[PDB]
Structures are given as structure tokens and as C-alpha cells.
Amino acid sequence: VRLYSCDACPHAVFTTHAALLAHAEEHHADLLPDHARLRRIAQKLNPVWNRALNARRNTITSWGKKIFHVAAQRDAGESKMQEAHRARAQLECVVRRWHDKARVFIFGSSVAMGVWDGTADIDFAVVDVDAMERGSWPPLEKNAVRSITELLRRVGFSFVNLEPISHARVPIIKHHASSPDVVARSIRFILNGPATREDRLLLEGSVRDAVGPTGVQQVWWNRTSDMMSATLESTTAAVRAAMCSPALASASLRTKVQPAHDECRPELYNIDFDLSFRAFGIRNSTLLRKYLLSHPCARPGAIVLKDWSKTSGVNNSVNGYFTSYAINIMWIYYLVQKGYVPYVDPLEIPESLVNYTDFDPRYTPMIDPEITNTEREELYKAAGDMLVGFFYFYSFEFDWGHNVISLNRPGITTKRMLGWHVEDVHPTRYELCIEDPYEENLNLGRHIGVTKSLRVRTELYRGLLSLLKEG
Numbered sequence: 001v002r003l004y005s006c007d008a009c010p011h012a013v014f015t016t017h018a019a020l021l022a023h024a025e026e027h028h029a030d031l032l033p034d035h036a037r038l039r040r041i042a043q044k045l046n047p048v049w050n051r052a053l054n055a056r057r058n059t060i061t062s063w064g065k066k067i068f069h070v071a072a073q074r075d076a077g078e079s080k081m082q083e084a085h086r087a088r089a090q091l092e093c094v095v096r097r098w099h100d101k102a103r104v105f106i107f108g109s110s111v112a113m114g115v116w117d118g119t120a121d122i123d124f125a126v127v128d129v130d131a132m133e134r135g136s137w138p139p140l141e142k143n144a145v146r147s148i149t150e151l152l153r154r155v156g157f158s159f160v161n162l163e164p165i166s167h168a169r170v171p172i173i174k175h176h177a178s179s180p181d182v183v184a185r186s187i188r189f190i191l192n193g194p195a196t197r198e199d200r201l202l203l204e205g206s207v208r209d210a211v212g213p214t215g216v217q218q219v220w221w222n223r224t225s226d227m228m229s230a231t232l233e234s235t236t237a238a239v240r241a242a243m244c245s246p247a248l249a250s251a252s253l254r255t256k257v258q259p260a261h262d263e264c265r266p267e268l269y270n271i272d273f274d275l276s277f278r279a280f281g282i283r284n285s286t287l288l289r290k291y292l293l294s295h296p297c298a299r300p301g302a303i304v305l306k307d308w309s310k311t312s313g314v315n316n317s318v319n320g321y322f323t324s325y326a327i328n329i330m331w332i333y334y335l336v337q338k339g340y341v342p343y344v345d346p347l348e349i350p351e352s353l354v355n356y357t358d359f360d361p362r363y364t365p366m367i368d369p370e371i372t373n374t375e376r377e378e379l380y381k382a383a384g385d386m387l388v389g390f391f392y393f394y395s396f397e398f399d400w401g402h403n404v405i406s407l408n409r410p411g412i413t414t415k416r417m418l419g420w421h422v423e424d425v426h427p428t429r430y431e432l433c434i435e436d437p438y439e440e441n442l443n444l445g446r447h448i449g450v451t452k453s454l455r456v457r458t459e460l461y462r463g464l465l466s467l468l469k470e471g
């Protein structure tokens, strides 16, 4: 026996879950207007579910085809992924000026999905692995945000694009890219006075030393010897050269540097990114990658569910619903429990970054470029079956009342196992429970109280019904 409280009014507490649910329906139908109705329609299909699957088999397969189409749009090919790799290397040049031993790791979707569409923002983590191993990373993050922001400004980033968020719970730098080849890898040094012949040789030497013996293609000075332009071998070498620290001969002669053109620039200038100083997302993303690569329909399904969850409102973290990360866990848990993919113990992914190699996320095509039409049709059928199965699983099979969506063990996780079978009554909620793989006692559904939970259940019924029809 325990207390249950409503999340839509301050004065409703009950001693049974049934009474809580009844109260949500009876007193807050305005907050969950479609729940009863969609549940009822879905409940009609349950007794004849296999017959429904059989009759709607063509439609389900067509949804499978659409799922792969949507997934294909997010796969912009290996060359596009390598643009992100180059941006990562450019950012690394910059942050090493602040802390020589820091390295840049990409995490998030390009790791988990093995593809990048060229528009999704990129997550960068900046970590000194030695320091992390000593228990001394990150340094004070507010200062790190400010230091790196200044370095980016000095290499040519505008305050219009750079958002330092030094006073957040996790301080980050957000880069907001504006919307709109030799120029892109060219830079310009502006001097505050005329350079002597010796000064000119020293600046060129500084650039040469920064990029190595192949890095500089061309250097030229203006008439008044107070601007030097350089074309480098790559966009990455261009950032590396911009990061040099010239030591000139003339007293007080100084330089400012920026890309030669305001719009045509190295990759880092052109991509939305969040820059953080913590390693947490790396292990996360690597675990998701391992699971999602283990069935050919896993990534396409995850992609369609991310979009579905956003449009249906169940993925909306600022208002306390799920994150895209949590939706990925729901999908993967379903794949594991139904036997579509093998279980992976979260502990199999090392916490330590000492042996890390994949700073640049490995590219894997969304669909095998060399499969037959027959194999492809089998994939569409499977994808449709699996997506329908996901909505069915969470609508009728998964015990939301007593169990937890968890990848921390291969068998059932009960709420009681985690101590989530009782709430301390904006409480931490245990209505819908998803265990975070690496952060113990964190429910990804902790902000989802009873009425919010029924909005979620509404959308699961809606998705189930949608896949059986023209949509």
C-alpha cells in the first residue's frame, strides 16, 4: 500500500493506482481528450490482432518502405560525414591552444546512427583523458566556456553565431551557423602597421611551422605590407594556420586573423554544434551505436520514432516529456525483449577513454548498397512489422504499472528492484519508468506524472492504429 498523487491538481491523493487513473480520466479529460476513445478502438483490435496484421499486411509493408525512405534522407553519404570529421579536427586545433592535452570527441546522433545529414547539430566533448583518469576533469567549466569562446572569436567566429552558456547546469558553448574550393582554405592576417622584410619572413615561418611542409600552398602580401594572405592545403590546415602565434621582430607589431571570405569558410564555421567538457555522452552514444547496428532495421526505426515522438509531443524534454535519447532506449528495449537484437551489457562499453579510437564517428550506410531487390523487400516487410510491434508492445504488452524499461539487465526490471515502486509525495515520478544505463537512480520519465503519462499512452495507441491504415 502507498500514496499516489495527481499531477494536474494539488489536492488529489489516493491509496490505489486504479483510483489515481480514474481520477485522471474523470477530472482531467481536458488534458487527455483522446485517451479513452483511442484506447477503446485499439482494444477492439486486440482480440483479432493476428487477423488485422494479416489483412493489413500490404499496408504494413508499405509503411516499411516509407520508413527506409525517411531513414535514407538522414544518410547524406560518407563525404558529408567527413565534413563533420574535419570540423572536429579544426575545433581540436582551437581548444589545444587553451589546454594542450584536451582532445575533441564527437558524440550524439552521428555516433549512434553512423550517418550525418549535414544539418543536425553535432555534439562535441572536449576532454583531457589523462586528467579524467586522475579524477581531475573537467576544470571549472564557466572559465573553460569563456576561454574557448574568446579563442573562437579570435580565429574569426562572430558573436552573432557564438552563444557561450557559462551559467547553465552544464556550461556549454552553442554555435548557431548562419545560412548562406581555394577561398574556404584561405586566411588573411591584418597587421596594425607595416611589416619589415624580417617581420614578413617571421609571420610566414609561423604559418609554415603550424601546418608543416605540405600545408602552405601560397602566401601573398598587399602593397603596404600590412596584410598577408595565405592559401593552405586544406580547410583544416587553414584553421591550424589561423591558430599560429606569430612572434614578429618589430616592437608592438600585432596581427588579427580570419578566413579570407565571410561566407565561404572551413567546416567548423558552417555547422550547428554544442561544445561541452564532460564525457558522459560518449559512453551513451557508443552503447546506442552497438545496439542500433545490430539489426538492419534498427536505425531506420529509431529515426522514424524520433520524428514521430516529436510531432506527437511525447518527445519534448523542456516540458518534462521524453528526450530523443529516451525514445531510443524504448525502441532498443523492445528490440531486446522481442529478440530482434542481442542484449549488450552497458558495462561492456568502457568508462575509460584511454583506448578510444573513434574520435571521428565511423560511417555506416543506412542500407547495404549491394543488396538485391528481394532482400530489400524483406527489409521493408520487417521494418513495418517491427514498428507496428513497437506500438503494440507498449500499448498492450509492456507492464507500465510494475516494470521498468531498462537495458541494465536482460530480463525484466521491476520498479521495486530500483526502489521506484513508491513515490516521495513536483515529485520525482515513477509512472512511466526508463532506467538510464549509466546514471543510477535516474528515471528518464521522472517529470511525467499521471495526466502526462496518459497523453503518452494516447500517442502510443494513435501510432498503433496509424500503421494499419493509409495514414
Ligand SMILES: O=c1ccn([C@@H]2O[C@H](COP(=O)(O)NP(=O)(O)OP(=O)(O)O)[C@@H](O)[C@H]2O)c(=O)[nH]1
Pocket (backbone or CB within 6 Å): 107, 108, 109, 112, 123, 280, 281, 282, 284, 285, 288, 323, 324, 325, 326
Ligand atoms: O538524458 C540524456 C540525453 C542525452 N544524452 C546524450 O546526448 C546525446 C544526444 O541526445 P539527444 O536527446 O539530444 N538526441 P539528438 O539526436 O541530438 O536529437 P534532438 O532531440 O534533436 O536533440 C545522447 O546520445 C547521449 O549521448 C544523455 O547522455 N542523457
Ligand SMILES: [Mg+2]
Pocket (backbone or CB within 6 Å): 108
Ligand atoms: Mg540533441
Ligand SMILES: [Zn+2]
Pocket (backbone or CB within 6 Å): 006, 007, 008, 009, 010, 012, 023, 024, 027, 028
Ligand atoms: Zn487531479
